[PDB]
């Protein structure tokens with residue numbers, strides 16, 4: 001993302 005992460009099932 002931008003210093004992190006979200007893009008994943010749950």
Ligand SMILES: [Re]
Pocket residue numbers: 001004005006007008
């Ligand atoms: Re993400």
